[PDB]
Amino acid sequence: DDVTVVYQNGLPVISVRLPSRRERCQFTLKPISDSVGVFLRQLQEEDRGIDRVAIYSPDGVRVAASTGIDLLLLDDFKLVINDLTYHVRPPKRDLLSHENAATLNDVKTLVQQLYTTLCIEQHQLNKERELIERLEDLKEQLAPLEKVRIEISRKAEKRTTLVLWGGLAYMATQFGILARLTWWEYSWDIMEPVTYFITYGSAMAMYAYFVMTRQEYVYPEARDRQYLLFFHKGAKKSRFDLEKYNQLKDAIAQAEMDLKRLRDPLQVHLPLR
Amino acid sequence: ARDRQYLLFFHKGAKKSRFDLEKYNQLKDAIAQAEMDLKRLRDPLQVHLPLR
Amino acid sequence: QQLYTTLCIEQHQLNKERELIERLEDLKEQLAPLEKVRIEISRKAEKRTTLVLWG
Amino acid sequence: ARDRQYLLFFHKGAKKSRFDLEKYNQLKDAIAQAEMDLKRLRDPLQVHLPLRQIG
Amino acid sequence: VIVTRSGAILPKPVKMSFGLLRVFSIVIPFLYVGTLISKNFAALLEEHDIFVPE
Amino acid sequence: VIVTRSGAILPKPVKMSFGLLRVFSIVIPFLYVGTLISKNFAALLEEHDIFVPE
Amino acid sequence: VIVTRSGAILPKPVKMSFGLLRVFSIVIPFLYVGTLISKNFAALLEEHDIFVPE
Amino acid sequence: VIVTRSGAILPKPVKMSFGLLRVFSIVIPFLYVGTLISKNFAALLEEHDIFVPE
Ligand SMILES: CCCCCCCCCCCCCCCCCC(=O)OC[C@H](COP(=O)([O-])OCC(O)COP(=O)([O-])OC[C@@H](COC(=O)CCCCCCCCCCCCCCCCC)OC(=O)CCCCCCCCCCCCCCCCC)OC(=O)CCCCCCCCCCCCCCCCC
Numbered sequence: 001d002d003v004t005v006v007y008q009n010g011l012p013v014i015s016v017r018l019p020s021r022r023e024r025c026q027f028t029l030k031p032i033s034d035s036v037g038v039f040l041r042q043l044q045e046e047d048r049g050i051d052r053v054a055i056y057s058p059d060g061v062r063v064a065a066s067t068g069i070d071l072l073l074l075d076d077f078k079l080v081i082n083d084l085t086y087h088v089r090p091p092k093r094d095l096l097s098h099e100n101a102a103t104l105n106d107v108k109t110l111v112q113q114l115y116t117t118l119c120i121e122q123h124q125l126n127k128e129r130e131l132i133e134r135l136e137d138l139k140e141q142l143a144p145l146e147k148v149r150i151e152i153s154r155k156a157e158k159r160t161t162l163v164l165w166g167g168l169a170y171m172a173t174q175f176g177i178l179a180r181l182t183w184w185e186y187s188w189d190i191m192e193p194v195t196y197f198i199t200y201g202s203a204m205a206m207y208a209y210f211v212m213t214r215q216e217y218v219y220p221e222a223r224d225r226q227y228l229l230f231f232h233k234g235a236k237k238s239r240f241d242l243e244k245y246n247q248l249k250d251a252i253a254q255a256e257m258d259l260k261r262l263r264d265p266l267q268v269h270l271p272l273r
Numbered sequence: 274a275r276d277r278q279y280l281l282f283f284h285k286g287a288k289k290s291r292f293d294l295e296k297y298n299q300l301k302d303a304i305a306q307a308e309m310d311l312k313r314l315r316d317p318l319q320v321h322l323p324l325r
Numbered sequence: 326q327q328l329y330t331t332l333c334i335e336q337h338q339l340n341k342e343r344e345l346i347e348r349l350e351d352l353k354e355q356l357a358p359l360e361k362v363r364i365e366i367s368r369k370a371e372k373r374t375t376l377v378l379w380g
Numbered sequence: 381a382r383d384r385q386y387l388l389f390f391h392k393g394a395k396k397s398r399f400d401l402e403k404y405n406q407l408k409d410a411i412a413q414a415e416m417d418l419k420r421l422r423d424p425l426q427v428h429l430p431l432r433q434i435g
Numbered sequence: 436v437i438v439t440r441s442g443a444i445l446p447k448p449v450k451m452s453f454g455l456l457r458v459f460s461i462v463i464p465f466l467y468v469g470t471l472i473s474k475n476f477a478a479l480l481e482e483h484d485i486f487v488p489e
Numbered sequence: 490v491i492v493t494r495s496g497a498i499l500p501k502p503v504k505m506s507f508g509l510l511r512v513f514s515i516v517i518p519f520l521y522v523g524t525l526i527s528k529n530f531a532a533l534l535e536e537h538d539i540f541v542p543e
Numbered sequence: 544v545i546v547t548r549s550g551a552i553l554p555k556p557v558k559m560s561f562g563l564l565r566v567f568s569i570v571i572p573f574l575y576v577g578t579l580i581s582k583n584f585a586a587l588l589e590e591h592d593i594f595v596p597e
Numbered sequence: 598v599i600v601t602r603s604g605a606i607l608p609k610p611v612k613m614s615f616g617l618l619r620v621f622s623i624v625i626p627f628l629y630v631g632t633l634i635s636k637n638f639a640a641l642l643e644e645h646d647i648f649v650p651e
Pocket residue numbers: 170201204205208209212213225226229230450451454455458462
């Protein structure tokens with residue numbers, strides 16, 4: 001019927017209908033490392049029953065046999081074989097390599113780059129001196145809050161420790177209870193159902209935990225969750241402005257990151273980021 | 274498993290409602306790219322813009 | 326050095342991008358035939374592990 | 381366990397078939413290198429921003 | 436973890452409103468449903484003399 | 490997770506075609522094979538006068 | 544993991560001081576307390592003869 | 598995972614030289630040692646008229 005062009009895995013392919021062998025022959029061709037001439041040679045070698053072949057621009061002027069295929073697939077064209085003329089429309093494609101003629105904007109950005117190269121040294125030289133001052137300013141604003149945060153997280157740690165040791169004591173006293181029941185008072189054939197349903201109830205509670213808290217019941221994660229809860233509920237009994245503390249910590253981290261990113265280009269003389 | 278079931282439900286609802294998810298994903302990635310190189314132009318260290 | 330770098334880096338990066346495209350189009354063309362053998366091997370390597378799981 | 385068994389099956393089927401796995405790996409790493417280079421070259425050529433360093 | 440990359444405290448975890456109520460309002464009813472289901476099914480198997488507890 | 494680093498959504502998880510059928514078409518026949526194996530092994534153990542439950 | 548991405552060795556793992564003593568000092572007394580309240584509960588149930596081992 | 602960040606394949610998993618033999622040369626002798634321990638302890642307990650099954 002007609003001719004189609006598709007890009008697959010970065011390579012263009014063109015499906016041509018051939019006169020001598022009425023079969024849709026496909027050609028996978030590279031746009032950069034080939035020309036129109038080699039494509040016509042491939043066509044002639046494939047058919048060997050076509051009298052001639054030529055490509056034309058959408059207007060009618062013949063396109064040279066040396067233009068690269070990437071220069072061709074930009075706009076539409078015509079492919080004429082000895083008897084038929086197929087209007088081939090390549091897929092819509094905008095840019096190839098960002099290589100074209102010069103523009104006044106290029107000269108403007110070049111002059112901007114020259115000015116930046118001339119002034120960036122003296123800019124960064126005192127930007128570091130201002131950053132090292134802002135860092136100390138932020139750090140002295142944080143000294144009174146750090147000890148308060150320490151005194152809050154000490155109580156939080158003490159309560160998490162109580163919880164952990166209490167869990168251990170509970171799973172020890174359950175062992176004690178069941179061991180006393182199974183060997184002194186009653187027999188094991190009485191205590192086996194109880195001790196299976198205890199296991200199943202624990203396996204159900206570990207799933208209700210996930211349903212309720214949206215995370216799996218793992219020891220260091222439940223521990224960290226309960227520590228965070230204790231901390232955030234202990235900051236209400238002290239009116240601790242956690243927003244200010246978080247803002248100060250983030251600002252100090254960002255200032256130190258800027259200093260570390262900026263000072264290395266001043267030592268080894270390399271680009272900035 | 275919960276996340277897998279949620280994704281299955283979300284994509285069945287998206288197919289039932291014809292949400293056109295691909296344009297939404299492309300727009301999200303393009304916003305993630307357009308504001309990255311914008312905060313890279315307003316860099317407080319490099320002198321790319323006046324009013325410093 | 327910084328000034329000279331500034332004056333002659335756009336044309337050098339354009340040549341570099343052109344060379345990189347010409348090199349990628351050759352690397353992919355050279356890799357094209359090995360992919361067939363890779364897939365013919367990975368199908369036999371996956372059939373036996375599906376057999377192992379089902380077993 | 382499934383991935384380990386799949387890898388053992390692949391590295392046995394590739395020895396039986398005499399597949400140049402080393403060339404395949406060193407050829408698939410060069411395409412990755414050239415595409416990371418093309419991704420890096422997007423800043424100084426399209427948005428006129430300074431090039432990102434290696435890493 | 437309890438702190439970010441910088442020394443900042445993570446926000447308090449989201450807590451489901453009335454968790455134990457919403458749990459024990461779905462555990463107990465279905466546990467009673469299971470009890471009565473087993474009772475009825477076992478009485479049904481006893482009436483037809485298929486399995487008798489001796 | 491349900492979203493990427495940006496707000497994009499992860500693709501639909503791959504689902505095996507006819508999953509339950511392909512599972513229960515290989516579970517049941519092997520339960521039957523195991524039943525047969527155990528029956529024959531018990532018969533042979535009773536044949537060699539080794540293990541006779543009483 | 545053993546080493547850092549650069550190649551340096553990870554720091555020495557912290558070790559709780561006298562952990563093996565604290566653990567048993569918590570396990571033993573509460574185990575005995577459990578045995579005690581189990582004996583007492585069984586005896587209290589036996590007094591009223593609510594449940595007898597029969 | 599079966600591939601790297603690029604399309605390359607992971608190296609071959611490093612197997613242990615004679616792994617199954619090296620593990621069954623440890624499991625069985627210690628199994629028999631435990632059997633001997635149990636036999637001797639049961640005999641010592643029954644000889645001194647401490648615990649007799651029947
Ligand atoms: C033998 C008889 C009985 C034996 C039992 C013995 C019991 C002994 C052990 C006791 C256990 C106690 C519970 C502790 C658990 C953990 C505690 C904890 O987290 O902290 C709680 C609490 C606070 O922590 P939190 O973060 O705030 O908790 C808030 C959240 O909700 C945060 O929630 P979350 O989302 O982060 O997740 C937590 C959630 C996680 O979710 C769960 O725990 C899931 C639970 C669901 C259970 C599923 C059902 C199981 C199926 C069994 C079916 C049985 C059927 C039987 C009948 C059928 C026939 C056989 O659980 C809860 O919060 C609920 C409470 C925990 C309960 C434990 C549940 C275990 C299962 C047991 C239930 C089954 C019972 C049935 C038995 C009936 C038999 C007939 O601790 C405190 O801080 C106390 C503060 C006290 C108030 C005032 C403050 C100061 C006081 C100090 C005074 C001293 C200082 C002096 C002054 C000095 C200054 C000057």
